[PDB]
Design a protein around this ligand. Sequence first.
Ligand SMILES: Nc1ncnc2c1ncn2[C@@H]1O[C@H](COP(=O)(O)OP(=O)(O)O)[C@@H](O)[C@H]1O
Ligand SMILES: Nc1ncnc2c1ncn2[C@@H]1O[C@H](COP(=O)(O)OP(=O)(O)O)[C@@H](O)[C@H]1O
Ligand SMILES: Nc1ncnc2c1ncn2[C@@H]1O[C@H](COP(=O)(O)OP(=O)(O)O)[C@@H](O)[C@H]1O
Length: 241
Amino acid sequence: QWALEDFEIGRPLGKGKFGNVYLAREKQRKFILALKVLFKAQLEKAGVEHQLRREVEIQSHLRHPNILRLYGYFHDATRVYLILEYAPLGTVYRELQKLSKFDEQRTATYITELANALSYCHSKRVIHRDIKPENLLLGSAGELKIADGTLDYLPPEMIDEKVDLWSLGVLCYEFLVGKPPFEANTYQETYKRISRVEFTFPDFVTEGARDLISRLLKHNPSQRPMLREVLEHPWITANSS
Ligand SMILES: Nc1ncnc2c1ncn2[C@@H]1O[C@H](COP(=O)(O)OP(=O)(O)O)[C@@H](O)[C@H]1O
Ligand SMILES: Nc1ncnc2c1ncn2[C@@H]1O[C@H](COP(=O)(O)OP(=O)(O)O)[C@@H](O)[C@H]1O
Ligand SMILES: Nc1ncnc2c1ncn2[C@@H]1O[C@H](COP(=O)(O)OP(=O)(O)O)[C@@H](O)[C@H]1O
């Protein structure tokens, strides 16, 4: 029976495409959470109010340490309110900006956590479209949380479960190098690069990391690893917390 007056609103955690995210405490049970406020005008505009109900339904029923929890939601005439797990350390994206690249241990760890979340998702017949750093939040103890321009993160085949592994390979590269592997001056250039799987490695990328990324960034989906092969990859196990 949720309503706005059920919450004490605190400082804005960030602005999104369709509204603001606020720190908020539930007066009743005194839960801490992130109150995400979406404007229906702006959702109807972008034509996203459809996909929103869907995405909300699915995300309600995921329970996993590395997937951001959606506790509830509600609305009024003008806006939709999403009651979200509060992630106190911000986005992986902004952490990539603060730091410039991630070290191997940090990178291996995120990928591990990412692969578990996706393994869990696959076990529920749920598939992501793209996992970008902006879509990843960090928990109180630095744990990764999937929250869910865009070109950069799309597989050649979108331009099957196997999409989520191209995603891992894009992220793994971005984490280590500081830029996405297919980054180019225009849309058309980026389209070609992704389409032909054209990436190169800077010298500091070690042999193990190159091997994993290369296995993940395979143009043809059937040749991409199983999530389990990622988890057990020698470079992963060598560097993951
Ligand atoms: N659960 C959360 N915990 C902490 N901060 C959040 C949470 N959700 C969103 N934010 C903050 O709000 C910012 C933008 O919100 P969001 O609406 O998710 O962006 P978009 O809709 O553009 O993907 C994020 O960069 C993040 O800092
Ligand atoms: N940290 C939290 N902040 C806000 N709401 C929460 C929090 N933890 C749980 N809830 C709320 O409590 C309800 C159920 O409690 P929860 O522990 O998430 O479920 P369960 O006990 O079944 O695992 C949810 O509908 C959600 O709204
Ligand atoms: N009363 C409160 N007001 C504002 N923020 C709070 C409050 N209580 C806890 N927090 C913050 O919410 C986050 C999660 O709280 P909690 O789960 O108790 O911390 P942790 O998970 O680190 O033990 C932490 O960043 C914490 O500092």
